[PDB]
């Protein structure tokens, strides 16, 4: 109910993988120019291209895709290097990838985009970007979480206004009938819960046991949230 996740969120291992890693562009160029093998995987399925984008190394990024690596490549659980960039907030790596076609909703394995991991790791700059680029706000990952459900679930305050602002549903459910208020109130995030009544969520709509956010928080145990939605009710 509460998962967005399967698992986590997550030899073969080459020249061109290590140089990439370490953002020493001149000797991927080099190994490029002997005929180092630009998309090889590793056990896991990353790309050179991957461990760039995962570092943070945008001119590797840039000169990788220039020279034709396939940024549609995804590891074994469906990260593309657009993923893993937005993973470690790598703003230029991001922009680079866009540049070259990258699909800002490309989803993983547990049907994420860029924007969901982003808010995940509460990546106020990349979500900007992505938010920017057309990112829909109200995608669906596993168990119908959107990037706002996972924003309040994660307490991530400037990445939810973010995408508030950008059009996301505070009404948005996922599969078991909870709103973001829902979420953040079981969480037991006082401010997140304020930030969604503030921009106009309803404190009284039930999930599908017929719960209200106030019901779940007292089922947690969580007691500022209790005293703020008793406030804001009763």
Request: glycine share 8%; charged share 20%; with cysteine.
């Amino acid at each position: 109910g509460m998962n967005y996740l399967r698992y986590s969120l997550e030899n073969g291992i080459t020249p061109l993988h290590v140089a990439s890693k370490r953002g020493n562009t001149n000797m991927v160029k080099l190994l490029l120019d002997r005929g180092g093998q630009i998309d090889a995987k590793t056990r896991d399925g990353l790309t050179p291209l991957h461990c760039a984008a995962r570092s943070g190394h945008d001119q590797v990024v840039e000169l990788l895709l220039e020279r034709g690596a396939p940024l549609l490549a995804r590891t074994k659980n469906g990260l593309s290097p657009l993923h893993m960039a937005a993973q470690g907030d790598h703003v230029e790596c991001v922009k680079h990838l866009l540049q070259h076609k990258a699909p800002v909703d490309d989803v993983t394995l547990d049907y994420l985009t860029a924007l969901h991991v982003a808010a995940h790791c509460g990546h106020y700059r990349v979500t900007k970007l992505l938010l920017d680029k057309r990112a829909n706000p109200n995608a669906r990952a596993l168990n119908g979480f959107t990037p706002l459900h996972i924003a309040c679930k994660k307490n991530r305050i400037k990445v939810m206004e973010l995408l508030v602002k950008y059009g996301a549903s505070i009404q948005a459910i996922t599969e078991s009938g909870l709103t973001p208020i829902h979420v953040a109130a079981f969480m037991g995030h006082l401010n997140i819960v304020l930030l969604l009544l503030q921009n106009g969520a309803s404190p009284d709509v039930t999930n599908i046991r017929g719960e209200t956010a106030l019901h779940m928080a007292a089922r947690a145990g969580q007691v500022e949230v209790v005293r703020c939605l008793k406030v804001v009710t009763e």
